[PDB]
Amino acid sequence: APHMFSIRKIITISDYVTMLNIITGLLAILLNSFSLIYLSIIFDSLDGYVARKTGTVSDFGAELDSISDVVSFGVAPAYLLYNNFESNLALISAIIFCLCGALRLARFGILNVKGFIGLPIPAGALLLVGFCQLINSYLINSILAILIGLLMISDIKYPKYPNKIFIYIFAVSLCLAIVGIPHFALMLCLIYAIYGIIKYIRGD
């Protein structure tokens, strides 16, 4: 309503990181690049940190963070699975995956302080793109796409903030994943995901 482009008046320096995230997420689809999903995970960790450090946390930025997660962690991995493993089964699996990412983002939007309920969408997306790069099988990667989707919409608790050590080596491994070597990021992400399930089943 105010003249033409009043939306610049609510954009912060954090939103610019978020937009970088949206670009890398969209380019993951447009260029068929797993490499850019790993960059998206780095940016998705960076935009909330910049918000808190620079003191520019905003509701608009919180919403754009989620919207960015849809592109890069919900649409893009499902696109990358189908485009690189074209089959009826990977079509249905990419659909489940994206839908499961969408529902946990919808559930995250309503309640989000406790931690992570279910596998967080950046971690799900890393698992899928990791499996897609290291396993040359549409059936298996189609199967895992559903298993990740089901974890994402689970009640399985996952901690929100890794320790300094884990951030440190996970940060390195995501960049190593950016340059073609995803094993350490995929391995680190499995341990996180599998440990969550074990705790749930064990009841601890």
Ligand X SMILES: CCCCCCCC/C=C\CCCCCCCC(=O)OC[C@H](COP(O)(O)(OC[C@H](N)C(=O)O)OP(=O)(O)OC[C@H]1O[C@@H](n2ccc(N)nc2=O)[C@H](O)[C@@H]1O)OC(=O)CCCCCCC/C=C\CCCCCCCC
Ligand Y SMILES: CCCCCCCC/C=C/CCCCCCCC(=O)OC[C@H](COP(=O)(O)OP(=O)(O)OC[C@H]1O[C@@H](n2ccc(N)nc2=O)[C@H](O)[C@@H]1O)OC(=O)CCCCCCC/C=C/CCCCCCCC
Ligand Z SMILES: CCCCCCCC/C=C/CCCCCCCC(=O)OC[C@H](O)CO
Q: What residues from 34 to 53 belong to the interface with ligand X (CB under 6 A)? A: 39, 41-42, 44-49, 51
| Least distance CB 106 / Mg ion (angstroms) | 11
**Tokens of residue 78, six digits:** 């499902």
Phi and psi (nearest 5°) for 44? -65, -30
Helix (H, G, I), strand (E, B) or coil at 5: coil
Task: Choose the contact partner of 127 out of Mg ion, ligand Y, its own copies, none; CB within 5 to 8 A by kind.
Answer: none
Amino acid at residue number 14: S
Give the per-residue contact string, 105-134, with its own copies (x = CB under 8 A; - = no).
xxx-xx------xx----------------
CA–CA separation, 152 and 139 (whole Å): 20
CB 2 within 8 A of CB 25: no
Contacts of 130 (CB under 8 A, 6+ apart): 177, 182, 185, 186, 189
Q: Which of 12, 14, 22, 124 forms a contact with its own copies (CB under 8 A)?
A: 22
CA–CA separation, 107 and 153 (whole Å): 9
| Least distance CB 199 / ligand Z (angstroms) | 20
- Asked if 15 is part of the footprint of Ca ion (rule: CB under 5 A), the reply reads no
Phi and psi (nearest 5°) for 157? -70, 140
CB 70 within 8 A of CB 58: no
Q: Which of 32, 195, 198, 199 forms a contact with ligand Y (CB under 6 A)?
A: 195
**Tokens of residue 81, six digits:** 């699975």
Q: Which residues bind Mg ion (CB under 5 A)?
A: 44, 65, 68-69
Q: Which residues bind ligand Z (CB under 6 A)?
A: 5, 7-8, 11, 13, 16-17, 19-20, 23-24, 27, 31-33, 35-36, 39, 46, 50, 53-56, 86-88, 91-92, 95-96, 99-100, 103, 153, 175-176, 178-179
Q: Which residues bind ligand Y (CB under 6 A)?
A: 14-15, 18, 42, 44-45, 47-49, 51, 57-58, 61-62, 64-65, 120, 122-123, 162, 166-167, 170-171, 174-175, 188-189, 191-192, 195
